[PDB]
Design a protein around this ligand. Structure first.
Ligand SMILES: *[C@@H]1O[C@H](CO)[C@@H](O[C@@H]2O[C@H](CO)[C@@H](O[C@@H]3O[C@H](CO[C@H]4O[C@H](CO[C@H]5O[C@H](CO)[C@@H](O)[C@H](O)[C@@H]5O)[C@@H](O)[C@H](O[C@H]5O[C@H](CO)[C@@H](O)[C@H](O)[C@@H]5O)[C@@H]4O)[C@@H](O)[C@H](O)[C@@H]3O)[C@H](O)[C@H]2NC(C)=O)[C@H](O)[C@H]1NC(C)=O
Ligand SMILES: *[C@@H]1O[C@H](CO)[C@@H](O[C@@H]2O[C@H](CO)[C@@H](O[C@@H]3O[C@H](CO[C@H]4O[C@H](CO)[C@@H](O)[C@H](O)[C@@H]4O)[C@@H](O)[C@H](O[C@H]4O[C@H](CO)[C@@H](O)[C@H](O)[C@@H]4O)[C@@H]3O)[C@H](O)[C@H]2NC(C)=O)[C@H](O)[C@H]1NC(C)=O
Ligand SMILES: *[C@@H]1O[C@H](CO)[C@@H](O[C@@H]2O[C@H](CO)[C@@H](O[C@@H]3O[C@H](CO)[C@@H](O)[C@H](O)[C@@H]3O)[C@H](O)[C@H]2NC(C)=O)[C@H](O)[C@H]1NC(C)=O
Ligand SMILES: O=C(O)[C@H](c1ccccc1)N1CC[C@@H](OCCCCc2ccc3c(n2)NCCC3)C1
Ligand SMILES: CC(=O)N[C@@H]1[C@@H](O)[C@H](O)[C@@H](CO)O[C@H]1O
Ligand SMILES: *[C@@H]1O[C@H](CO)[C@@H](O)[C@H](O)[C@H]1NC(C)=O
Ligand SMILES: [Ca+2]
Ligand SMILES: [Ca+2]
Ligand SMILES: [Ca+2]
Ligand SMILES: [Ca+2]
Ligand SMILES: [Ca+2]
Ligand SMILES: [Ca+2]
Ligand SMILES: [Mg+2]
Lengths: 214, 595, 466, 213
């Protein structure tokens, strides 16, 4: 099969900028490369076909280039609606194969996450089991790491994490972290902490509580 | 009866180009000059590397009689890859079918082959070109992704075409789905708006298309021929199409709804391999505003006085009725192997009598297979079963028969004289001829003979000289005339009267005119269009009893009125003609008293 | 009756009816039945009235028994007649047909060679000998030839890529020869092993649409007498073997072919039909014309799916019949023999020539004089039996030219030559006696007891001037 | 005005099969191939194969040769795909897309999510998240142990939208877990009541969990 590779899986751009996405095939595909746009909701639109032919209805900002094995989609004067993932697809031979995808995200001034830690609800503790939830909200860029510290120890076993899409109004992202333990295990320890490491500050932001205390 | 055959407009194309295989009138929307469109599907072109791509020509009317090719497409074959053509335009027969509606010209190449994007193939999907003003777009509805004989790969889309009154295209392709055939209708607005030369199979919204059916229907040839007309009274033109191999070669004609391609009505042939459906036409022939259906079976075989079969062809005339039924009659050819009914052309109202008319071609009839065209006038009951005129091809060829009448188009007044005119093609001699309709003079003639009863003994009238002894009466002859269209307000008539016409050579004429003393009286007359009944009187008498012992048979007074056609000419050079339906003779009779 | 309006001249009186006469010199209305004229004083010598009559010119008796000499075979009698027919009159001719016990038989085997007939070829490897051995019991002069057809080798009936042109079954894959219209391979011959050889060497071709171009091959086999080898005075059996529909007429319009078939032979140096890509398929009307002209009996040997279609075709074609063919031609020998036996068991009349505008009535007298039927065919008869026919000919109106007509049994060379000559003149018309005293001092011509007046004179005796 | 409407989400147990549809409008369905594409959650695009609707002919990626079977109903302008011998690797979104030509696919359907689990429908456990005992305040809501997707969550009946962050669900011992945060002014809570409205239609569940301390 033909392998398609988009070197950069993600890039960041500001409004009006010119964006160029690169796509490379493992063989000569004789200009049968197409570009598609996928928006966060799952929508998929054809933008470019046969390397450089605009599909009916897509704007003139988009334009395509290439030959042989190397190709590129160009966005000029990027719009707010342009933020999406862009795939490249060869149609010269079956099976049709796609590239990994390139995600275009807005640029923003670095921001610090607002962090909040929540102990397990009383409703949950009667069920057995205890979830400690930590919310990191409105931070730029997306790269982030979280570590759970109990009584001076790291578990990294019952933790589960979720990431929000880039918000439309303000380009920041958000992160939710939940550590789940048994009630007996929860009852054995006293301190519970949520340590965030972000590019904006070298000193990890920390938020914690003590079960016995109030 | 009023077509001018003495001096028609004769156009010619390149030898061997089948110039005249298709013909249509061209009328621009800006009320500009009118032209003739002529297909020459075997004509060589300047397209690089294309042999006999064919072309469509626009022809001036009378200004010069010159024809110039219309540039629908100046290019050769596109390439899928180096030395790997995408399409094959040589011998594509461009101009095999040509239709026009106001500014738009649709011309098609039913033998255009193409490669497909996957394998190296050569599938005759057919293509068309649509030209509005500057804008020209390709229209290949059968160049889809449904490939091979199974699909539309051999569809030959454009084999037949027509416009609906609401700017829809009706296109026939007899090869789809293992030659089941197919009808496709697209809005001209879609055809041009969705056009994109980078996309070979265009997704047209609101397309209508017959669907693939069970294999029993293979090899039927739906779309061999098409016409349009309303047949469920909703004002939307519906689709009529010939299916000449259906019903195990009895032939059929399908009518589909022009709104959803739903099946509406069916006709079926009566004889095996008559090619019932080779041609079809839709026009209101009897003036009830309900379109009527004409179907040609040019190989139909009649039975003769000797009981022998003879291929003469046959046309069926189906008058539409409000109840949805049809009232059908047949119309047989006149010459054997002449293929009467190969072409059927609505003419409009040729004689401007209030009923549409129609021409039916026998392209291989006449002397030395020079071709014949028959004009049939309509009337309230249906179609007059006797042709009012016969057009005869005048040219002979040495390779393929002249085929005069193989294509025709009428119902356009190209000389703006008030009467529609007719185009006839003759592709075997690379000729196309225009016949202009002469204006029609209707005449009301009267003849009064008073006294009617004649008594020999009664002699109160005097002969020239001193004879003073004859039995007498008088004859009053009148003519009145009018017309429609471009005509002068004065006409020279030649009237002739003949007493006792019933008696023939070798038999005595009992009645003689007073002055001349002979039974024949001639007279020139002048009458103005729309004038009052202009009359004239004269006096006659009887011979002596001794001279004729025949007092029984009535004396008939005969009046004949002809016209001088050259004197009534027009700037066109087009002389008027008397209405053939009105008899140009009238007779009254007088009797002898008996005692 | 014959005193109606008009009829004031002998020739005028002749056309009103066939039973009417004319009278001369009244020793008005001289035109009436002959008996009435004698009642009113017209003498036998003076009465005038031609009547339809037959003259027998050649009436050699029908040949009885097996004839060692082809020249003494007589299968129809009479063989030449003159028929003088008065307008509106009818004369009945008696025609006698008898099939000789030993009559030669030509059989041309015309076969579909599209891909679905490969099995059919394997099973007829020895048909030539099998067939000629069975036909040896029925005739001492059997000859047979072979030809094959597929389709007009043009788009859209064949794939036109280079690969499929060279081998239309290359995709299958299977060895096929390029598509061809009609190949005349073996002219008629008595050498049956030669028939075996050429069949064994045959290879199939292919094409993409179901109906085939057999009609092109039928036309050629019927017209190309010299190259096919049809010999006079023998049966001409054309056996059309196919398992498919047939293209006809303007089907070729799809391929850009729009010049009608011309009914002429067009076999090139390779004995291939050269106009395959130039002329339309023949129409049914055209095939009828040339099959009758060349006296060729057509036999449709087709599969079950096609029988009803080809039976309807055979209804239109004189002498055509249909036999139900197995998918592998395993029973083609039986079909042929059955067809030949049915043929030798019938006699159907045929009337050719200038017959347009004539009225013909046929009555068949089979089984000696016992059976009378209003057909032109006697069936279920043993070879040697005689079939008699009563043919009536009527000429509606008088004509100025004689008609050459041929009456013959279908499928047999022997024919009766018939000339129809009109007789709508009177004997007295020729004796004009111009400028006779009787027509007022030479003012007319005494023709038949009535005056033909000169121009400018009127009256019975031309006694008035105008 | 071309539109491809795909059927709704499919749920199936391992080893079973599912059949999803894709109805076309705005063009002649029979004249254009229909392609199918697979996209695993958070992953790229994988091409399954195409079908010629009018003829039923299909071609598949070698991968899905035994997995998928494509069919088409020309009378309704609908294409069908059936996934057989299901596993957890077949859990993904499956798109249909018409054929532009030129080796491209011009119009895509919305996608049909396919989830392959043994779990059966289960109602959620909605837990309020209040802070521990100062201009803005963050409250939370935890929706745990519910199946299948979807669940719908709002704060004070959707009155609070700005400052809300509802996160996507995650698998957790073969059940879905979801969380949501709302941020309001410090002076408006607890003075005014904030409630987490959760609804799980698969279970006819509707909880309104207020947050008090
Ligand atoms: C493909 O398209 C077809 C046309 O769009 C469609 O046929 C239509 O079907 C619908 C529903 O099935 C019908 O509506 C129904 O009508 C009946 C009673 O209808 C009667 O009255 C109407 C009104 O008459 C006015 O319009 C006509 C225009 O045709 C004028 O001349 C007239 O003067 C009035 O102004 C009349 O049109 C109907 O006439 C149709 O049917 C009769 C009976 O067969 C025919 O004689 C006639 O030629 C014409 O075909 C009829 O007299 C009512 O009870 C229902 O409640 C509903 O309102 C449409 O009438 C009908 N239109 C047609 C047939 O032209 C096909 O169904 C569609 N097929 C598919 C698969 O989509
Ligand atoms: C004018 O003349 C034409 C030509 O004959 C007529 O058109 C035919 O009409 C018939 C009847 O409507 C059509 O036959 C129908 O086809 C339908 C489609 O079949 C689908 O499913 C089969 C499964 O075997 C597939 O092979 C096929 O491709 C389709 O996917 C059938 O569903 C119909 O069946 C119904 O009626 C039959 C009647 O016997 C019942 O037995 C069934 O149980 C069911 O109730 C039916 O077989 C045929 O296809 C049409 N041909 C063409 C070329 O269009 C017009 O109807 C006629 N019009 C008038 C006004 O006379
Ligand atoms: C259009 O131009 C083409 C050439 O560009 C003309 O075709 C060429 O001329 C004739 C066709 O009538 C062919 O000559 C003939 O060839 C055949 C076969 O070799 C032979 O049997 C004849 O005796 C004669 O020699 C020639 O091959 C052909 N070349 C092609 C088709 O490539 C064509 O006639 C022109 N048509 C018109 C309408 O102007
Ligand atoms: O005669 C030969 O050379 C050659 C041949 C080639 C190889 C082997 C045997 C025969 N025939 C010529 C005609 C062709 O038939 C094909 C008929 C198939 C019937 C058929 C299917 C699918 C469809 C249809 N209809 N309609 C509707 C659309 C789908 C085969
Ligand atoms: C004169 C002539 O050619 N005769 C031939 C001859 O071969 C044959 O023997 C003869 C018998 O009747 O009839 C025939
Ligand atoms: C019989 O053959 C001879 C030549 O052998 C030929 O002249 C004659 O025309 C043939 N018969 C007929 C009826 O033509
Ligand atoms: Ca309508
Ligand atoms: Ca009418
Ligand atoms: Ca008229
Ligand atoms: Ca005019
Ligand atoms: Ca076979
Ligand atoms: Ca064929
Ligand atoms: Mg075949």
């Amino acid at each position: 099969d033909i392998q398609m590779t988009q070197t950069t899986s993600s890039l960041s751009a500001s409004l009006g900028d010119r964006v160029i996405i690169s796509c490379r095939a493992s063989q000569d595909i004789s200009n049968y490369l197409s570009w598609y746009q996928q928006k966060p909701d799952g929508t998929v639109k054809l933008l470019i076909f046969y390397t450089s032919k605009l599909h009916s209805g897509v704007p003139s900002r988009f334009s395509g280039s290439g030959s042989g094995t190397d190709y590129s989609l160009t966005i000029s004067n990027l719009d707010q609606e342009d933020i999406a993932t862009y795939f490249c697809q060869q149609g010269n031979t079956f099976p049709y194969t796609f590239g990994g995808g390139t995600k275009v995200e807005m640029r923003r001034a670095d921001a610090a996450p607002t962090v909040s830690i929540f102990p397990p609800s009383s409703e949950q503790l009667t069920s057995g089991g205890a979830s400690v939830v930590c919310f990191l909200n409105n931070f730029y860029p997306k790269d982030i790491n979280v570590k759970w510290k109990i009584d001076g120890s790291e578990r990294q076993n019952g933790v589960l994490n979720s990431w929000t899409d880039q918000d439309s109004k303000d380009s920041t992202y958000s992160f939710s972290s939940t550590l789940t333990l048994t009630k007996d295990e929860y009852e054995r320890h006293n301190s519970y902490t949520c340590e965030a490491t972000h590019k904006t500050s070298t000193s990890p932001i920390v938020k914690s509580f003590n079960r016995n205390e109030c | 009866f009023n077509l001018d055959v003495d001096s028609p407009a004769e156009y010619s194309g390149p030898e061997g180009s089948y110039f005249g295989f298709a013909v249509d009138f061209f009328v621009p929307s800006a009320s500009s000059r009118m032209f003739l469109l002529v297909g020459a599907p075997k004509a060589n072109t300047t397209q690089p590397g294309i042999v006999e791509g064919g072309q469509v020509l626009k022809c001036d009317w009378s200004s010069t009689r010159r024809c110039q090719p219309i540039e629908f497409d100046a290019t050769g074959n596109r390439d899928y890859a180096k030395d790997d053509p995408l399409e094959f335009k040589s011998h594509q027969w461009f101009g095999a079918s040509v239709r026009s509606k106001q500014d738009k010209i649709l011309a098609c190449a039913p033998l255009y082959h193409w490669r497909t994007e996957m394998k190296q193939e050569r599938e005759p999907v057919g293509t068309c070109f649509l030209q509005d003003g500057t804008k020209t777009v390709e229209y290949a509805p059968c160049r889809s992704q449904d490939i091979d004989a199974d699909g539309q790969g051999f569809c030959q889309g454009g084999f037949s075409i027509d416009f609906t009154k609401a700017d829809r295209v009706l296109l026939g392709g007899p090869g789809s789905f293992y030659w089941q055939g197919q009808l496709i209708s697209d809005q001209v607005a879609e055809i041009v708006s969705k056009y994109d030369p980078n996309v070979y199979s265009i997704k047209y919204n609101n397309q209508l298309a017959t669907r693939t059916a069970q294999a029993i229907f293979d090899d039927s040839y739906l779309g061999y021929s098409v016409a349009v007309g309303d047949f469920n009274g909703d004002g939307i033109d519906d689709f009529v199409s010939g299916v000449p191999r259906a019903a195990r070669t009895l032939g059929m004609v399908y009518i589909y709804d022009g709104k959803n391609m739903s099946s509406l009505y069916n006709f079926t042939g009566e004889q095996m391999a008559a090619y019932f459906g080779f041609s079809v036409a839709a026009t209101d022939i009897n003036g009830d505003d309900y379109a009527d259906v004409f179907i040609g079976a040019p190989l139909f075989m009649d039975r003769g006085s000797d009981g022998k079969l003879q291929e003469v062809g046959q046309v069926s005339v189906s008058l539409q009725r409000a109840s949805g039924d049809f009232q059908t009659t047949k119309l047989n050819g006149f010459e054997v192997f002449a293929r009467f009914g190969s072409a059927i052309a609505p003419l409009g109202d040729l004689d401007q009598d209030g009923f549409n008319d129609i021409a039916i071609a026998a392209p291989y009839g006449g002397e030395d297979k020079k071709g014949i065209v028959y004009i049939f006038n309509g009337r309230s009951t249906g179609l007059n079963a006797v042709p009012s005129q016969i057009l005869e091809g005048q040219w002979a060829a040495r390779s393929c028969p002249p085929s005069f009448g193989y294509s025709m188009k009428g119902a356009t007044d190209i000389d703006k004289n008030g009467y529609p005119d007719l185009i006839v093609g003759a592709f075997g001699v690379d000729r196309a001829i225009l016949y202009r309709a002469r204006p029609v003079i209707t005449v009301n003639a009267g003849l009064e003979v008073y006294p009617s009863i004649l008594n020999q003994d009664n002699k109160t009238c005097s002969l020239p000289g001193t004879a003073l002894k004859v039995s007498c009466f008088n004859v009053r002859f009148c003519l009145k005339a009018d017309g429609k269209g471009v005509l002068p307000r004065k006409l020279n008539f030649q009237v002739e009267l003949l007493l006792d016409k019933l008696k023939q050579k070798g038999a005595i004429r009992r009645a003689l005119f007073l002055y001349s003393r002979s039974p024949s009286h001639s007279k020139n007359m002048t009458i103005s269009r729309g004038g009052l009944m202009q009359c004239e009187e004269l006096i006659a008498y009887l011979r002596d009893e001794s001279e004729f012992r025949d007092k029984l048979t009535p004396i008939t007074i005969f009046m004949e009125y002809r016209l001088d056609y050259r004197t009534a000419a027009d700037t066109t050079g087009l002389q008027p003609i008397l209405n053939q339906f009105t008899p140009a003779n009238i007779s009254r009779q007088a009797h002898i008293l008996l005692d | 009756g014959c005193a109606l309006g008009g009829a004031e001249t002998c020739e005028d009186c002749l056309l009103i009816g066939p039973q009417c006469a004319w009278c001369a010199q009244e020793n008005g209305e001289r035109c009436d039945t002959p008996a009435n004229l004698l009642a009113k004083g017209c003498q036998l010598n003076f009465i005038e009235n031609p009547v339809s009559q037959v003259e027998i010119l050649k009436n050699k008796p029908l040949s009885v028994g097996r004839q060692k000499n082809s020249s003494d075979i007589v299968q129809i009698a009479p063989q030449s007649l003159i028929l003088k027919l008065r307008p509106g009159g009818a004369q009945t001719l008696q025609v006698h047909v008898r099939q000789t016990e030993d009559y030669p038989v030509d059989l041309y085997y015309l076969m579909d060679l599209s891909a679905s007939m490969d099995d059919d070829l394997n099973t007829i490897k020895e048909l030539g000998s099998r067939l000629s051995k069975e036909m040896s019991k029925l005739t001492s002069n059997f000859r047979l030839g072979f030809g094959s057809f597929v389709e007009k080798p043009v788009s859209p009936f064949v794939k036109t890529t280079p690969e499929e042109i060279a081998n239309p079954c290359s995709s299958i894959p299977y060895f096929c020869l390029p598509t061809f219209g009609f190949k005349h391979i073996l002219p008629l011959t008595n050498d049956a092993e030669r028939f075996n050889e050429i069949v064994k060497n045959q290879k199939i071709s292919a094409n993409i649409d179901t109906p085939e171009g057999g009609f092109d091959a039928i036309m050629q086999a019927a017209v190309c007498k010299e190259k096919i080898g049809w010999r006079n005075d023998s049966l001409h059996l054309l056996v059309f073997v196919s398992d498919a529909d047939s293209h006809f007429g303007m089907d070729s319009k799809l391929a850009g072919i729009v010049c009608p078939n011309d009914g002429l032979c067009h076999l090139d140096s390779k004995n291939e039909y050269s106009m395959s890509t130039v002329l339309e398929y023949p129409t049914i009307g055209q095939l009828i014309d040339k099959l009758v002209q060349n006296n060729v009996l057509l036999i449709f040997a087709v599969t079950q799916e096609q029988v009803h279609l080809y039976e309807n075709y055979a209804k239109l074609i004189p002498g055509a019949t249909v036999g139900l063919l197995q998918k592998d031609s395993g029973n083609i020998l039986q079909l042929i023999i059955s067809a030949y036996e049915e043929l030798r068991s019938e006699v159907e009349l045929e009337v050719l020539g200038d017959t347009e505008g004539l009225n013909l009535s046929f009555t068949a007298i089979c089984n000696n004089g016992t059976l009378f039927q209003h057909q032109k065919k006697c069936s279920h008869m043993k070879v040697g039996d005689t079939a008699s026919f009563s043919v009536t000919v009527n000429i509606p109106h008088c004509e100025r030219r004689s008609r050459h007509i041929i009456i013959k049994p279908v499928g047999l060379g022997d024919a009766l030559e018939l000339l129809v000559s009109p007789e709508c003149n009177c004997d007295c018309q020729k004796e004009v006696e111009v400028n006779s005293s009787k027509c007022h001092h030479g003012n007319g011509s005494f023709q038949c007891g009535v005056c033909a007046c000169h121009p400018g004179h009127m009256g019975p005796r031309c006694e008035s001037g105008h | 005005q071309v539109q491809l409407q795909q059927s709704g989400a499919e749920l199936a147990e391992p080893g079973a099969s599912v059949k999803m549809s894709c109805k076309a409008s705005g063009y002649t369905f029979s004249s254009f191939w229909m392609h199918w594409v697979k996209q695993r959650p958070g992953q790229g695009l994988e091409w399954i194969g195409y079908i010629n609707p009018n003829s039923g002919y299909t071609e598949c990626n070698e991968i899905f040769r035994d997995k998928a079977t494509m069919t088409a109903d020309t009378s309704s302008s609908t294409a069908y795909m059936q996934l057989s011998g299901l596993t957890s690797e077949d859990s993904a979104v499956y798109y249909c897309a018409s054929f532009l030509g030129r080796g491209a696919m011009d119009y895509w359907g919305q996608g049909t999510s396919v989830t392959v689990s043994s779990a059966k429908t289960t109602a959620p456990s909605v837990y309020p998240l209040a802070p521990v005992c100062g201009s803005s305040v963050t409250l939370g809501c935890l929706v745990k142990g519910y199946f299948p997707e979807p669940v719908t969550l709002t704060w004070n009946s959707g009155s609070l939208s700005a400052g809300v962050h509802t996160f996507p669900a995650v698998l957790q011992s073969s059940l879905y877990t979801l969380s949501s945060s709302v941020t309001v002014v410090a002076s408006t809570w607890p003075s005014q009541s904030i409630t987490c409205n959760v609804a799980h239609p698969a279970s006819s569940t509707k909880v309104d969990k207020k947050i008090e301390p």
